[PDB]
Amino acid sequence: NPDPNA
């Protein structure tokens, strides 16, 4: 699961 934030 990749980073969904900035």
């Epitope: 699961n1 990749p2 980073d3 969904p4 934030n5 900035a6």
Partner: antibody, heavy 122, light 107 residues
Framework: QVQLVESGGGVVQPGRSLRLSCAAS????????MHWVRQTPDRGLEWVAI????????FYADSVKGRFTISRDNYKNTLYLQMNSLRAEDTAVYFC???????????????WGQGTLVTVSS | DIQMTQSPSTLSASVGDRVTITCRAS??????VAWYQQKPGKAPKLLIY???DLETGVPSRFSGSGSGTEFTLTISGLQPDDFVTYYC????????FGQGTKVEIKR
């Protein structure tokens, strides 16, 4: 402090639609990915959908692909969930959940809303 | 998908006990396991992430271990406020919770 407030729950006739909202405050809403997670009395915690901070990417659980749609308003700071073709399996409490990511932890949940009940009945 | 199963479904102990909840995965997920605690009527709360990393502010009696397929949550010295429900979560491919474990007061 962080505050997530769900609204829009209620009774839906099978096959009809419904939209849920989640008012975020106390942080920069535009920088965090957001989740929807639901809970059934006898099925447990079931992840529904995730949307990116900028809304670029979006993924759904298989049980809702084609029926549900997760959107986002980075100005009114509100998360949305459009629910079409509601089944009885969809009856549950729907939680708003902010995404937490770190290099060691990965994508997770940290701040949740109070939940809102959706009852698919006739 | 990846399935998550916790054992046992219901735990019976007294205040001060040391109890362990075990979470098994349907396929190897390395150390991508978190542990959440849900109190009645309230939302889940993060306690452990990455199998064994304690979340900030969580008391030290909570503890987690495991790698691959089997994972354990341990509470050394149960407190009165701990007799609730505990879920394990995988965060390798998407997210899957266990069924939950109610910790019950033995009488």
């Amino acid at each position: 402090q962080v505050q997530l407030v769900e609204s829009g729950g209620g009774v839906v006739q099978p096959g009809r639609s419904l939209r849920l909202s989640c008012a975020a405050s106390g942080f920069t809403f535009s920088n965090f990915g957001m989740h929807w997670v639901r809970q059934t009395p006898d099925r447990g915690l079931e992840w529904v959908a995730i949307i990116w901070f900028d809304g670029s990417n979006t993924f759904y659980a298989d049980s809702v692909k084609g029926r549900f749609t997760i959107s986002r308003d980075n100005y009114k700071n509100t998360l949305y969930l459009q629910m079409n073709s509601l089944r009885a399996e969809d009856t549950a409490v729907y939680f708003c959940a902010r995404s937490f990511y770190s290099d060691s932890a990965g994508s997770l949940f940290d701040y949740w809303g109070q939940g809102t009940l959706v009852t698919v009945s006739s | 998908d990846i399935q998550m199963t916790q054992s046992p479904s219901t735990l019976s102990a007294s205040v001060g006990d040391r109890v362990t909840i075990t979470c098994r995965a349907s396929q190897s997920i390395s150390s991508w396991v978190a542990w959440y605690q849900q109190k009645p009527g309230k939302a889940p709360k993060l306690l452990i992430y990455k199998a064994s990393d304690l979340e900030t502010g969580v008391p030290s009696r909570f503890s987690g271990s495991g790698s691959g397929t089997e994972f354990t949550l341990t509470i050394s010295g149960l407190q009165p406020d701990d007799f609730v429900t505990y879920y394990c979560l995988q965060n390798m491919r998407y997210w899957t919770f266990g069924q939950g474990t109610k910790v019950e007061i033995k009488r």
